[PDB]
Amino acid sequence: AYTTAQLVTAYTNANLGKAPDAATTLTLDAYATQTQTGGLSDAAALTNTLKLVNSTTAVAIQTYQFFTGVAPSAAGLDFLVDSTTNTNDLNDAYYSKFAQENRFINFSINLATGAGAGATAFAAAYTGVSYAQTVATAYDKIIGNAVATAAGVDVAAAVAFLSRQANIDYLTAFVRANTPFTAAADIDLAVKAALIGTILNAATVSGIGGYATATAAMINDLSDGALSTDNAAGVNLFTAYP
Amino acid sequence: AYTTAQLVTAYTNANLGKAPDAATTLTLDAYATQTQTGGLSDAAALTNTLKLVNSTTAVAIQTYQFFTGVAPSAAGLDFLVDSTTNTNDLNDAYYSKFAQENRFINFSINLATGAGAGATAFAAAYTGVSYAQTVATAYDKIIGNAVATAAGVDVAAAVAFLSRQANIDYLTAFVRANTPFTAAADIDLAVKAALIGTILNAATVSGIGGYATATAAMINDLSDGALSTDNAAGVNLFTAYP
Ligand SMILES: [Ca+2]
Ligand SMILES: [Ca+2]
Ligand SMILES: [Ca+2]
Ligand SMILES: [Ca+2]
Ligand SMILES: [Ca+2]
Ligand SMILES: [Ca+2]
16 A cells, blocks of 8 residues: 555656656556555556656667667666756656657667767668568567567567558658758668667557566666666666566 | 677578678577567577578588488588688579579589489489379488378378479479470489479478488587588488487
């Protein structure tokens, strides 16, 4: 049985010091009183609280891992998610009109195709490969192929959907309008980045797959105020949370 | 848990020093990260890596064994698969437009009907025997008859399929067009060679049978850089890997 004042601290630390909106406070309060009456277990209530921190936090953990091979340190996360120093950060004014999806896509393009940390590596790895293959291989890296089938979702139908011509056309226009790229190679390269972003979203929303399960456990550890692993130059998800 | 840099060395040695394409690197990378998250066992990941070396390598091991009675030595394999000296080799320019199937057929005709090593022996063994019998006996030699039935595949339906008149007609035209044979006996002889080739393909793609299981174990041994058996004048599969 959690007091509503415990669920707010659990939410605050997950959001790295951003105190929840008036609306969500009411949501948390419901989760509290549903545990006092035994209509909800303890672990269940805490999971739902941390599900609300998806857009703000999970966006920074997951993308950093996929592109740079390592999730950001606690100190680093602070900077990306909720800080005094970064004027524009994930839970700040700049981003208040981006949905969940467009947040993932934003982060991806930043890290991948720019002067971002992942540019040089991602540029060499995904050169001269087709849209179809980009999606198929990435799907398996993130969500697993065996895991998805056991979970009951049909892989083939999903991969086909992501790589259909209509989808690719939509992104091409999107990337051309938004990003300052004009070269034919860089646009091609950025579209792939946006696709992987779309997959990361699709993963974190369903809870299936290796990436999603590890990120969940990192946020759980981050909940109580202190991050146990907290290597100075980044925490590799798959090492730390088996 | 394999690092993606381990799976590439495992692939490279199997391909005898040919470094994988950009596309396949992405495939291997997925297999790595699926072992770090425990959505895939270790042995399973390594098998799938070596499954990718089928077209290049397994083609040289299996055909040599069937026609000359012995798989090529490590030094020999180098020459056939990936070398400086042989301008045209299996993982080189000449063969880049042949599918898996047409590779098997190519190797078979070479070794069997030409001035190839197997010509004299294969010529005496398969003279004055019908298409039906050629297929039936070969099926049993390669895939086993008991083994296939236990595996659940119905033998009778498969053998009939391979020896139907339509199939024979297709090959006759194929052999006439491609190979420099004009005599009525040599064409007949080459068609049989092409049939056995087709069976070798059908074997290595399903994983059933004695030939396929032994070739798999030879490639596994070849994976780590050094071939244990490595007799100078050839390795007999069935002796070395029981
Ligand atoms: Ca803070
Ligand atoms: Ca701020
Ligand atoms: Ca902790
Ligand atoms: Ca070599
Ligand atoms: Ca060569
Ligand atoms: Ca060895």
